[PDB]
């Protein structure tokens, strides 16, 4: 385990474990509250790099979790969906994939086709989904 | 089969980016002297635990030359430095028509004794006082000897801080959330190529950000049998970065006892000069143990063998060309700048397969502007008392044999011709990533039918 | 999806004993099992056992884990994803019933339900475990036996007559010329001297100007000789 | 379709698509990471407006956002509440208003109750029915 602890193991072992990749994503022990505590300019060229590193920290944090909100899986960390697997995307068979790839290569091979996968993702889960209460959220 | 799409957060997945890093270290300078010129009144404290995973079965490629986190150095030192000077006293008044003196020929002189007119606190009045002034910082112009200082001529001139430390301390470069450092813990490491192990630590170790001329000080040492690492080898021209297995001893000194002698140019400002020598006048020094160098200067021939025509002719030259300050070991010390003479130590030449101590001579220069920055240049005041230095030199810079085509022989004389360079022999196994937490799989799993 | 290549053709002895090599590539030779089956003459193809390169572990089979001891080094990065490694094999006391064709083969998946058996195949390696000794071949020109050559093509060869041990290919000069030629396989003399023919198919048209020199390359004799046709013909 | 396709169409045509406005909220093209990469101060009047640019995006998705997740919607892009719709709001009838009014229109005729209907949206969806697991988490 660690932090990407199972980056180089097989993608069946990063689907085991995965939240410590997730946890240590946002808050950094590194920031470590900012000031001296314990010359009064603050204007430093540190200052500048610190803030617009937290900045791009929970920039690049909220661009990937709206991608999630979007989606319905906001609440939870793995999420299945309704959208069916088009096989022009791979060839390979189901445990072909997953004890034989690793996640760093695979994320080479649909790296052309992702954005597509993203677009159709919106639609067939909450698009249509969250709409089809209008039949059953009462009749 | 029905195979359904499943998303997942938090996948271990990475692309090579480069983003803006910041700095770390803890308890340094403090309360006894503080005011250092690189970790300035406050840095975000290092976590006294160093984070580092052994990454397992994985293969990333780093390459050191194309690599950014050297020339986000480069630029962050050179601002750091400008924002160390940018509030002190200005020297423009310091440049008037200087009558200048030899000393104690005895009728052995390589300073003056210079009389010069100079404004004081109030601005209607002026007041003649004597400094000493090192050679090539003052130059003549057309019976009784006049001079200049050589910095009026180009740019203006501001006067180093009196309580600032010019010593490296170490200064950690560490990643922003979603980021990750890769480290190169292959030993071996011939120039660059895919690194068998890695880890992805949080925080790089202690770099000092020692500011050295073709020789370096203070670095990290692999533990094999000293690296060789260039961008391309046999581009004669590109440079050649050197890496020992264990470092080289070399103390400096000056032992000329310089009184501070502080005179007002105006209020507030208060320019200090060097001034009256207490002693006899003495050369400074730098000591290097024989014994010691000739080993390392071996291992290194034993290692070039087979990068350089395998068995032939490899010699060492003088540095070749260039110009007086980038020749010569420069580096600073308690706050005065020396330029050792290194022909001394790149004269032997081995092939075909209590104690004494080599020893260079090193003169000391008060006026600078390094980096081939020509914007500003900075008066270093002396310090005052005694100088003496003790740092290992663990690297080393060399460059071309001109362009022999082909033919029977290689020499590599030194010559340190550019400072990012002294950083990339701290960062070769360094490398930042982007993590990307959003990585999609299919799987014949589907949720509820309605919602 | 890297060839596996054997390096092979080593045969000595009985109670000799030899070691074999397999030259790997296009894959992460890390974490992939690699594994060694044989037949025999007798049919029956036998696994001698599986090794993994990381850690170490290997279970041979209980037949040969006496006197069979295999071994092998790390591998060199090549991306981050191939690397080039090798695998090699030690035997100790052998018969002719050890006598046969050798793979090597990479194992399937990197998972924990079923690893041990091969994906990728070796080229193979002809082990020959005879007592009889070394002897080089014969090389003999084969007769312009009339054949319909309309269109100006006709298909002609060279022979090759008592050899031993092993078989071996015949080519070519310079290459080039692979694709529609037929050599045709081993004969077993009844008085132990193995033989073989080729038959190329490519236009002949009339004799002289083309080129009719056949290459042939071998084993403990080498090669040094290589004939032509005789000019004599028919039609 | 398109960002903001649907302003001027009937709010049952907004209610239709919703994603396209959703998703370029958060992140864009436009901050276009930064950096020149390819003088050396950053304090030019333009990176003063692009980072306080840059704040009021997270800073004003961020309040939106919490909203949401004080309401039990957070995981999703349209939630049904057990708040009952007040007469006093708005006399008009279920089809008069979603193929009539345009959205554009209809948050003018709630702007000066608006708020009084947020404050009521917190107490029955969330601060009475999170607590209902009391009789029902365990008996
Ligand atoms: C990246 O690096 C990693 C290392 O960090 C590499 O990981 C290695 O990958 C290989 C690929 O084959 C593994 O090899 C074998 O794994 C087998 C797993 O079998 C498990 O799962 C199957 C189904 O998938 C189950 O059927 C098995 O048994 C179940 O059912 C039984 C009933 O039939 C039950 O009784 C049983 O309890 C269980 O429910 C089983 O769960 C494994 O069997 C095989 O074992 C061989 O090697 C062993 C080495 O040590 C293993 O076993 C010991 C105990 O003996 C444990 O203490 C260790 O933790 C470890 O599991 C050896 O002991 C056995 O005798 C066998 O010779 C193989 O292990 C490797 O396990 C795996 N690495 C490690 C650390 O073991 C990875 O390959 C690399 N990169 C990539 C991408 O490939
Ligand atoms: C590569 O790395 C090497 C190794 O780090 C590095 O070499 C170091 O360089 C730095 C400067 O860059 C040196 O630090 C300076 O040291 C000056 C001289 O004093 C030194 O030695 C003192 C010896 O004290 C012992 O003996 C005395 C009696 O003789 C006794 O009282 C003590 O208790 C002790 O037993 C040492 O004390 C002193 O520093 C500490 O303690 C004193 C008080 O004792 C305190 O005043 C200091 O603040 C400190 O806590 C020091 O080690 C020193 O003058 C200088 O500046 C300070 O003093 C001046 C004097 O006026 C003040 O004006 C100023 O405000 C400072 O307070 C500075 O501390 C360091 O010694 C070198 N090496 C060592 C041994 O670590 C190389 O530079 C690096 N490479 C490069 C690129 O150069
Ligand atoms: C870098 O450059 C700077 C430049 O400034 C250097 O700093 C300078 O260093 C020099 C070193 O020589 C200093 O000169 C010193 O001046 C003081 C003060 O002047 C008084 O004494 C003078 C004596 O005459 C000198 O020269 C004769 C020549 O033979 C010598 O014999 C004698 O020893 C002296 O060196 C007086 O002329 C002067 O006049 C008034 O008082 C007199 C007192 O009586 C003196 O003279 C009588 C004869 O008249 C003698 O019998 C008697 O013994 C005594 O010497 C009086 O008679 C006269 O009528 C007047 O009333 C002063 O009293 C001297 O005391 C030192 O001996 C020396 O000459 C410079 O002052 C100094 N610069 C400054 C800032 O002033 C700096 O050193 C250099 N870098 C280094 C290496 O540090
Ligand atoms: C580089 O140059 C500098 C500048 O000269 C050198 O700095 C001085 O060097 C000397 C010699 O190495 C040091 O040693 C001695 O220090 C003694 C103490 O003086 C200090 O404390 C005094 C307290 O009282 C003391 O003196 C009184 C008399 O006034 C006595 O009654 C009493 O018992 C004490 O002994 C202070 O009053 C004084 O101001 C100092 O702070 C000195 O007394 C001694 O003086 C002798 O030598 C002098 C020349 O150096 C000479 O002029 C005198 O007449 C006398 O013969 C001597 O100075 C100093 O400690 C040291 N520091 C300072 C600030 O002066 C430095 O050493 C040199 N580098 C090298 C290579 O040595
Ligand atoms: C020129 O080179 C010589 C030879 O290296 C140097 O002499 C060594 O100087 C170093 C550092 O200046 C000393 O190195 C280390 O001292 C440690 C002190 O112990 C503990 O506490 C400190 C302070 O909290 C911690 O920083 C430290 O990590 C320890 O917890 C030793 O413990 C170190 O030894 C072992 O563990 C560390 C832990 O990571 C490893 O990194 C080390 O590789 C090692 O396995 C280490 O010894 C050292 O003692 C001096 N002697 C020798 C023979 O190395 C000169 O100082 C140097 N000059 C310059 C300026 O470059
Ligand atoms: C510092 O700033 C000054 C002023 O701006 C610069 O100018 C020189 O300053 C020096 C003093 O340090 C001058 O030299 C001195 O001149 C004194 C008198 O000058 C007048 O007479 C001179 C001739 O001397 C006769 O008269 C004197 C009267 O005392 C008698 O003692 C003599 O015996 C002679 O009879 C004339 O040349 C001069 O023009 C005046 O009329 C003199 O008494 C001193 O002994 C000394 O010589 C010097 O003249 C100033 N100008 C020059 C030409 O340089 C100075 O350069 C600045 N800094 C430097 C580099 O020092
Ligand atoms: C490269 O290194 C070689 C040596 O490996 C070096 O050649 C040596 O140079 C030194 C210094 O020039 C020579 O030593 C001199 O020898 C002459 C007689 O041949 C003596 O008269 C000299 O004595 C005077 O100078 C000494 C100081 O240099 C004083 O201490 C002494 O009192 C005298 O005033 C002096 O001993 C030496 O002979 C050669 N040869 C050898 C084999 O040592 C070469 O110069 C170096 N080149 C460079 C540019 O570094
Ligand atoms: C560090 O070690 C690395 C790993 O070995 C080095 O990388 C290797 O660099 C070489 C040169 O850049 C690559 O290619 C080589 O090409 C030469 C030239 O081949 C051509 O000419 C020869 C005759 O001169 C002829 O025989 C060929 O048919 C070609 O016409 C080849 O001779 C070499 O065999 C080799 O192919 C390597 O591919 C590359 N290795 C890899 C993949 O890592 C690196 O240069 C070393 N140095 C540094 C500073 O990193
Ligand atoms: C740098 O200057 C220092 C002195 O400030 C010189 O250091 C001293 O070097 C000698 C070399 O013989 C050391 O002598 C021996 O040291 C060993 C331990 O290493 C000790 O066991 C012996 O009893 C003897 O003292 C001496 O200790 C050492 N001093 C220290 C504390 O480092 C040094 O040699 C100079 N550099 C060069 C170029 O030699
Ligand atoms: C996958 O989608 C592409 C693009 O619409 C289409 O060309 C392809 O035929 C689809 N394959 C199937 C049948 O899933
Ligand atoms: C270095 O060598 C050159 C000749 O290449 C020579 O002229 C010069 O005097 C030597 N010394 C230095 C340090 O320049
Ligand atoms: C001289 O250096 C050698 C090697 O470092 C060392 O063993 C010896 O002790 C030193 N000098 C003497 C004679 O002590
Ligand atoms: C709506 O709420 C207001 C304020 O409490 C109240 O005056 C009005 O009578 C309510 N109307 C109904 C009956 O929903």
Not at chain 2, 296 to 309: A, D, E, I, P, S
């Amino acid at each position: 385990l660690g932090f990407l602890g199972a980056a180089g193991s097989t993608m069946g072992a990063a689907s085991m474990t995965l939240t410590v990749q997730a946890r240590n994503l946002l808050s950094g022990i590194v920031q470590q509250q900012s000031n001296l505590l314990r010359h009064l300019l603050k204007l430093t060229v540190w200052g500048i790099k610190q803030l617009q590193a937290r900045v791009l920290a929970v920039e690049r944090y909220l661009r990937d979790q709206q991608l999630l909100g979007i989606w319905g899986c906001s609440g939870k960390l793995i999420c299945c969906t309704n959208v069916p697997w088009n096989s022009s995307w791979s060839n390979r068979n189901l445990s072909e994939i997953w004890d034989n790839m690793t996640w760093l290569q695979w994320d080479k091979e649909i790296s052309n086709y992702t954005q597509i996968i993203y677009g159709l993702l919106e639609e067939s889960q909450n698009q249509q989904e969250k709409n089809e209460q209008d039949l059953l959220a009462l009749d | 089969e029905n195979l359904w799409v499943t998303v997942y957060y938090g996948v271990p997945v990475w692309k090579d980016a480069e983003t803006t890093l910041f700095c770390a270290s803890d308890a340094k300078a403090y309360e006894t002297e503080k005011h250092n010129v690189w970790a300035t009144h406050a840095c975000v404290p290092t976590d006294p635990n160093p984070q580092e995973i052994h990454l397992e079965n994985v293969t990333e490629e780093f390459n050191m030359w194309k690599n950014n986190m050297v020339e986000q150095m480069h630029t962050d030192i050179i601002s750091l430095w400008d924002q160390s000077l940018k509030p002190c006293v200005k020297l423009t008044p310091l440049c008037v028509t200087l009558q200048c003196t030899n000393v104690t020929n005895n009728i052995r002189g390589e300073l003056k004794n210079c009389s010069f007119n100079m404004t004081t606190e109030l601005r209607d009045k002026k007041q003649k006082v004597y400094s000493l002034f090192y050679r090539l910082d003052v130059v003549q112009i057309n019976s009784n000897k006049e001079y200049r200082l050589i910095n009026c001529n180009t740019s203006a001139i501001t006067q180093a801080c009196p309580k600032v430390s010019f010593e490296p301390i170490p200064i950690h470069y560490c990643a922003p959330a979603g980021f990750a450092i890769l480290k190169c813990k292959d030993k071996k490491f011939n120039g660059t190529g895919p690194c068998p192990s890695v880890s992805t630590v949080q925080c790089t170790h202690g770099i000092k950000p020692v500011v050295s001329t073709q020789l370096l000080l203070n670095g990290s040492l692999a533990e094999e049998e000293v690296m060789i690492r260039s961008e391309n080898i046999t581009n004669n021209a590109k440079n050649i970065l050197v890496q020992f297995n264990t470092p080289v001893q070399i103390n400096c000194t000056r032992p000329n006892n310089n009184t501070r002698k502080s005179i007002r140019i105006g209020p507030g400002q208060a320019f200090y000069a060097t001034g009256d020598i207490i002693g006899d006048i003495r050369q400074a020094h730098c000591n290097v143990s024989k014994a010691t160098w000739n080993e390392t200067l071996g291992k290194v021939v034993k290692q070039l063998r087979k990068h350089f025509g395998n068995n032939t002719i490899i010699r060492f030259a003088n540095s070749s060309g260039g110009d007086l300050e980038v020749t010569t070991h420069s580096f600073n010390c308690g706050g005065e700048f020396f330029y050792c003479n290194t022909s001394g130590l790149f004269n032997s030449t081995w092939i075909s397969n209590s104690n004494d101590s080599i020893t260079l001579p090193c003169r000391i220069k008060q006026i600078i502007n390094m980096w081939q920055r020509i914007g500003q240049a900075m008066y270093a005041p002396p310090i005052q008392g005694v100088i003496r230095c003790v740092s290992n030199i663990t690297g080393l810079i060399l460059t071309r044999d001109g362009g022999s085509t082909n033919s029977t022989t290689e020499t590599f004389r030194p010559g340190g011709g550019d400072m990012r360079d002294n950083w990339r022999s701290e960062l070769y196994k360094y490398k930042v990533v982007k993590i990307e937490p959003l990585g999609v799989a299919p799987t014949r799993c589907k949720r509820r039918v309605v919602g | 999806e890297g060839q596996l290549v054997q390096s092979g053709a080593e045969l000595k002895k009985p109670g000799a004993s030899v070691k074999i090599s397999c030259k790997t590539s296009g894959y992460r030779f890390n974490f992939y099992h690699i594994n060694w089956i044989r037949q025999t003459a007798g049919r029956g193809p036998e696994w001698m056992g599986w090794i993994s390169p990381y850690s170490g572990d290997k279970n041979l089979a209980p037949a040969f884990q006496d006197r069979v001891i295999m071994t092998t080094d790390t591998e060199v990065p090549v991306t981050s994803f191939t690397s080039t490694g090798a695998a090699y094999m030690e035997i100790r006391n052998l018969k002719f019933d050890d006598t046969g064709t050798y793979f090597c083969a990479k194992g399937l998946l990197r998972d924990g339900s079923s690893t041990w058996l091969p994906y990728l195949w070796g080229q193979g390696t002809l082990l020959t475990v005879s007592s009889a000794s070394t002897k080089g071949p014969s090389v003999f020109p084969l007769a312009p036996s009339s054949k319909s050559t309309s269109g100006g093509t006709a298909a002609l060869g060279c022979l090759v007559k008592d050899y031993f041990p092993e078989p071996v290919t015949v080519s070519w000069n310079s290459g080039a010329l692979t694709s529609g030629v037929h050599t045709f396989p081993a004969v077993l003399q009844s008085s132990g001297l193995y033989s073989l023919s080729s038959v190329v198919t490519v236009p002949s048209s009339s004799l002289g100007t083309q080129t009719y020199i056949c290459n042939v390359n071998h084993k403990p004799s080498n090669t040094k000789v290589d004939k032509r046709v005789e000019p004599k013909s028919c039609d």
